[PDB]
């Protein structure tokens, strides 16, 4: 509703592999406290096309820049894999 559960779209080799061939799959990063139903509702109220299904990924934080004078940890991400129906492809940028 508030639409803070759609933080940032991400484009990788896996994302572009899915994002072709009839049904498109768009991968965003979402609020780690959000649920699948909230993700579907946010997509409904801000894009307008109902997701067919949603998959979720949790990437655990890990040490980064090891050995550098000040080491730091990573950031917690929840990934969501929306798949729109056959023949529909909306643009993530441009509204």
């Amino acid at each position: 509703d508030v639409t803070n559960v759609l933080l940032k779209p991400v484009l990788t080799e896996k994302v572009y592999f899915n994002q072709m061939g009839e049904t498109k799959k768009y991968v965003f990063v979402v609020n780690p406290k959000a649920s699948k139903t909230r993700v579907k509702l946010a997509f409904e109220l801000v894009y307008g096309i109902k997701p067919l299904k949603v998959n979720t990924l949790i990437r655990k934080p890990t040490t980064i820049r090891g050995g550098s004078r000040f080491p730091g940890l990573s950031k917690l991400e929840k990934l969501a894999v929306i798949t729109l129906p056959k023949g529909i492809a909306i643009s993530v940028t441009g509204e």
């Binding site: 991400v10 484009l11 990788t12 080799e13 572009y16």
Partner: peptide, 30 residues
């Protein structure tokens, strides 16, 4: 031709070399 010249190396953030998008190479590195 021109797009061939702009696909060599110049690795994008989330991508690698070689498999550079055939159409999307003018957004990050503009």
């Amino acid at each position: 031709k021109q797009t061939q010249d702009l696909t060599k190396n110049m690795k994008i953030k989330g991508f690698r070399k070689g498999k550079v998008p055939p159409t999307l190479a003018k957004d990050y590195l503009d």
